[PDB]
């Protein structure tokens, strides 16, 4: 618990990467979070949006 400064510097960088990866599961208002769904379900004219 005395090395909490160094272990927190490791934790904050791990939480920043884990947050950056979990945001790939978000829809952002698209039909799917997974890009191969959109490109396998829709024409390019529709999929571009």
């Amino acid at each position: 618990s005395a090395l909490g400064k160094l272990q927190d510097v490791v934790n904050q960088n791990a939480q920043a990467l884990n947050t950056l990866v979990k945001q790939l599961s978000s829809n952002f208002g698209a039909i799917s979070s997974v890009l191969n769904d959109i490109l396998s379900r829709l024409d390019k004219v529709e999929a571009e949006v």
Binding site: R41, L42, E46
Partner: protein, 50 residues
């Protein structure tokens, strides 16, 4: 059926060309939602209900 009492048909365990449908001049309307009408030949479904 009358539209107050619409039929539902389970479609399952079979293969379906949709181009025989979407190429036909018969259809006065042919909307699709969440999928392209053209793309249906490239996909599978758990069941379909007509």
């Amino acid at each position: 059926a009358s539209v107050y009492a619409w039929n539902r048909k389970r479609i399952s365990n079979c293969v379906a060309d949709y181009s025989v449908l979407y190429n036909s001049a018969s259809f006065s309307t042919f909307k699709c939602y969440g999928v392209s009408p053209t793309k249906l030949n490239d996909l599978c479904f758990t069941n379909v209900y007509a």
